[model samples]
Target chain A: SKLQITPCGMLVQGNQINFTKLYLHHTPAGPEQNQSAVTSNDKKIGLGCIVVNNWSVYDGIGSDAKLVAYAKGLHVFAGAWHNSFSLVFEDERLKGSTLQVMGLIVEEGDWAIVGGTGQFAMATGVILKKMQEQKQYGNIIELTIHGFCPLL
Target chain B: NQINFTKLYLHHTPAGPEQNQSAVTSNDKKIGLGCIVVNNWSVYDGIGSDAKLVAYAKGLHVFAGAWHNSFSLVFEDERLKGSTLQVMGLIVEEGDWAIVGGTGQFAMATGVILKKMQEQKQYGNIIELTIHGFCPLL
Candidate 1:
């Protein structure tokens, strides 16, 4: 049995919910070390969805201390020697967010790059520069941030 | 959410046909030279490597070894309510038996199977697999 919170301030426990697994279908599949593009045509694959462990957002309010609900999602973007991805975090309370860029750490491929949104390009350049400066030119890179909220 | 903790440590070193032989050399201290033969015929052939099996709870902790040989499934303990296992590692152990250690009845039996060759030893040393009684969560 699991304890779940309701948006209406009610606590619900012991309920049957369907669970589904999620998968991402990345396209332009080439060398992980090659720069690429994720066009609008890049199809998305819906692996499956489940509700067994799902909780209502309402249950997180008014707990005296700050309650942080962490949801982990992955963004597959283009980059060189290494493939790049972003881990995005959104705080419902704030209108700002943060992105952590990760690249290949042990592979000897060109740093992969992708062209799409401006924000994406800006972040990609910054990441590449940082890697070059720090000599952390590994195939995989990881970026993390705290106190970031997204715009509603 | 439910948090289930499952810790596993598996070590084996095939030592020809000898029993409890010191296969452990200065270079390989963690080697188990003893051949225990956990799976004579590929465990994947009989039960498909990807066959979903419940190691815990009636409706929780379901997983399958995609690559066969040997596999270890680790969940967030906080995310067991769903079938999302982080899949720490998956390997195929050919030519040697294995030694495994973990908690709970399932872990013990799993250990026995690899360490003592329970399959060849028949049901006497074999243990029946059961449904895990709880879900994992984050």
Candidate 2:
């Protein structure tokens, strides 16, 4: 037997989030390089992690909550989330969604909902990301999220 | 010459079911593997038009249950024409993969691809890719 599940939500796109403070550390870096130091022809790959704090997600029904995301990237541009990220939603119904995303750190990108706890167990779907505001530290992003899973 | 091209890919079905079984490593270790038929278009300012079936990119990517993964990629572009460009690189969860090397016109080509999700829904998704690089034309 199988049950159907659906999740719908809207995330605000604005500069309410701080990005500079989130950039935690970088490995083997001064500034990220375009080519490898030893072999100039090859690309120089680097790794880094960011700790997101006080990001907001609004349910669009007059209710809002906070979210914390731990992001990791593999390359000179640490802004990209090449790795998986754990997005913890303060909303009781939808909390702890693990997102696996790919592509550049630009205004638009796609993400997959791999899994999560609470209402999002065994969840799978695609995420449509749009950058609303671009800043030096943080980007106000609008996430049009969709997902499906077994009813919990 | 430095060239910039953009392409929009429409996938009506999931990439997982269509992947080659022999190329896949492990269920949890591999995400998906497939080939994309690219119609490269010239972009000016922000608008894009004049589509030509310019290239095909075949990639095999492994997730390894992490955010980043390793990818083996091959490119056959009309600019390079019949020359097949092969390169190995990392596919990070964010940004673009670095274009390390290739053959033909791309023998010394080096740059990056910037990808974005144009649209997504229950049915399918449209992904837009912008390739930026300087290819040493023969």
Candidate 3:
């Protein structure tokens, strides 16, 4: 059933939304190298492949309400790498579904959330990330996802 | 030492249709838009010892009621025998699409891939890719 009219929707505009995820699995893509560097530019870059089972989303700092999403991707430090992730929003208002997102993560730059499904159909956005806590087992990340969808 | 070269070939039997559901038409031709999983290999120089496997390629190509479409291709390669390089970039015909970043021996790598249409056939179209770039030693 296709309608001639255009349909538009907004996802929590003007509200602070954050996601915290833990890396459940980690696999080294290449050979193991020393992290120590002789010079400032002598850093040896390597690859780390990771998978996230579930990520908790919060409305704001100290807010009781939360949402959950899942993601899997890879990371490259010396240079940069692309991420192919499917983020499924488990919130009731935003009909729980999967969003197909693919983008390149430049060094110290933002990762593009190119597209998605459901409420995010033909959606395009960007994800800003920050490392809140770091551990050998897993790392805690603070992510801010901004998405926009143009209805056809 | 920098290696610069041009690669020309045809991309055939593309797996079609995933996210973008609508059929896009441009200049009386229908252009399909969706995600295509590519798992094909090609020979370097000729089809002999110089063979390179694509390994895995996940792409997002969108045709939004326009002539010029937009696409994102992220792939891993098995060219260097022991190590695999993860490469990703944006694709726009007749436009400057550079290899933004990668891993392995190609860590901190930067380069540009220029593509041009050579021939269009029923099975697939032959496109020429000119890669001019290099990676810094890690």
Error of 1 at A21 (Å): 24
Q: Can you write out model 3's per-residue Cα lDDT over A1-152, one digit (the tens) per residue? A: 87696667644232333333411112122232111212121112122222222333444333354545555332222223445566776667765566554444422234455456776665544565556545454444556565445543
Where is model 1 more than 4 Å wrong at Cα?
Answer: A1-137, A143-152, B1-71, B74-118, B121-133, B136-138
Q: Total clashing residue pairs per candidate?
A: 49, 10, 1
TM-score of 3: 0.37
TM-score for every candidate vs. truth? 0.19, 0.33, 0.37
Question: Which runs of model 3 end up more than 4 angstroms from their true locations?
Answer: A1-67, A73-78, A105-108, B1-114, B117-138
Model 2: per-residue lDDT, tens digit, B66-115?
Answer: 32322222223434443323323443223565544343334334567665
Query: Chain B TM-score of model 1, please?
Result: 0.19
The candidates' DockQ values read 0.01, 0.04, 0.04
Error of 2 at A100 (Å): 5.0
lDDT string for model 1 (B102-124, tens) is 11111111112212222322222
Residue-level lDDT for B77 in candidate 1: 39
Q: In order, what fnat does every candidate score?
A: 0.00, 0.00, 0.03
lDDT of each: 0.21, 0.37, 0.40
Which candidate would rank higher by DockQ, 1 or 2?
A: 2
Reference-based TM-score, model 2: 0.33
